[PDB]
């Protein structure tokens with residue numbers, strides 16, 4: 001038992017991290033087979049920050065303007081193309097540490113591990129969720145651009161995030177590994193701000209199910225609710241709407257605990273009204289929204 | 302900017318994990334050079350665990366009584382011995398993935414990363430503190446025994462923990478890699494409980510410094526205090542006494558922010574007395590005590606491995 005914010009083992013991603021340099025700009029790249037993926041803004045200079053013309057800046061580069069370093073080895077760039085906001089450097093060596101991998105674009109509420117890297121070297125690993133406003137609450141200093149987010153369900157590494165920038169409110173924005181941003185953001189230093197954030201309702205319920213599995217029942221009540229009445233109350237606390245999809249997804253946790261999803265929704269309504277009265281759930285004094293139903297079942301008995 | 306609970310990158314340790322089976326018991330081993338380390342209680346049946354005689358049980362065993370698997374490869378066991386509560390299994394082959402490593406014993410209050418494993422397969426990594434009562438608040442299921450805890454200093458892995466058991470309260474107990482328990486526990490199926498725990502004062506202060514550095518500042522104030530004064534408050538609230546050593550360890554963060562430790566203790570004093578006035582610090586409603594001063598400086602300066 002016990003319940004912890006738990007990341008995937010990072011070894012399969014550590015073997016893929018490299019340094020990419022262009023002009024005076026150094027950031028992280030991701031080395032899979034014979035390709036290195038990195039944010040295209042590596043090719044920008046001081047004035048290219050506001051309104052860069054990427055197609056114009058790239059056409060002015062040759063393969064030999066890109067310095068790629070895997071530890072001590074200098075990889076040789078033989079090819080370069082752009083896909084959306086991601087630059088792809090072909091190299092003469094395929095990475096011998098390349099794992100089974102795939103690229104997936106996740107939805108708001110999904111969780112992944114982040115391997116924070118500086119100068120192509122890993123610094124640490126932690127768990128994040130894609131917020132409903134398409135940002136992540138990360139830990140990223142200058143030089144962390146090119147750091148990736150991933151899941152490792154069953155020895156295959158699914159890459160879902162590459163880090164591009166920090167927005168003025170201290171939250172983080174990036175792309176899938178095909179270079180398409182999550183949310184309405186662009187790789188320009190023009191004024192940008194995230195939408196108002198909301199609490200991931202389905203994840204809060206999954207964590208309440210986790211608390212019950214780990215033998216906590218103090219927050220339950222004899223009440224139930226309609227899905228509609230639940231959504232009318234929840235949205236008054238900036239909670240995401242709960243859909244029939246979300247209800248279906250909680251089915252197995254419902255079955256294991258014998259508490260119906262709409263009975264647990266009644267428990268959540270009460271917690272939102274009363275708070276915790278000096279108690280904690282699974283070690284938190286807040287309702288936690290960065291554990292998915294899949295996360296809860298993976299970690300729990 | 303931003304501040305998260307962050308583990309060390311685990312790859313150097315994933316390359317050392319193997320599966321050890323003896324009879325019906327499977328659990329995890331650590332394979333370093335030509336030795337596999339695991340808990341001695343692998344050699345016990347359920348009946349044995351009630352009142353085990355490890356000396357006597359172990360001599361009755363032989364090398365071929367121990368199945369050691371590194372992925373889809375059997376290792377050949379050529380020797381077996383016991384050091385305290387750890388079994389050492391000498392094998393015919395050195396781990397070609399052995400990193401630069403030391404065995405280290407940590408102090409209460411210090412943090413480390415756990416690589417949770419099952420059947421010799423790394424499953425997850427998370428950051429823990431050795432509690433003042435010598436338990437860790439882990440996440441472990443059946444089969445997790447032999448999972449290890451570690452730090453990284455430059456390119457050297459310092460192994461500090463091997464998982465042995467869950468206590469009735471949901472918290473976890475284990476040894477260093479020389480087989481000495483952390484806390485007053487024994488490897489036997491018997492009634493054991495965690496001492497009442499306390500809050501790691503110097504870690505809470507480090508976390509308030511991380512809050513300030515990330516622009517969380519409401520809890521600050523014009524006041525200051527003394528060790529004596531604060532410590533009488535600490536004692537009252539089940540906090541560790543704050544030593545002059547703790548105040549010296551926080552020097553960097555007191556500098557880099559222009560808050561003095563007793564300045565910051567005055568903020569913490571008010572928080573324990575008054576509460577958080579329904580606010581949060583770094584997205585917590587609790588005073589968080591599993592970040593060391595080193596953890597805060599490492600994360601707010603970008604130290605790499």
Ligand SMILES: CC(=O)c1ccccc1C(=O)O
Nearest residue numbers: 140141142144145165166302
């Ligand atoms: C890269 C990143 O997230 C970051 C972190 C801290 C300060 C600035 C940035 C930036 O957007 O360059």
Ligand SMILES: [Cl-]
Nearest residue numbers: 105106107110
């Ligand atoms: Cl998804």
Ligand code: NA
Nearest residue numbers: 522523524564
């Ligand atoms: Na003060």
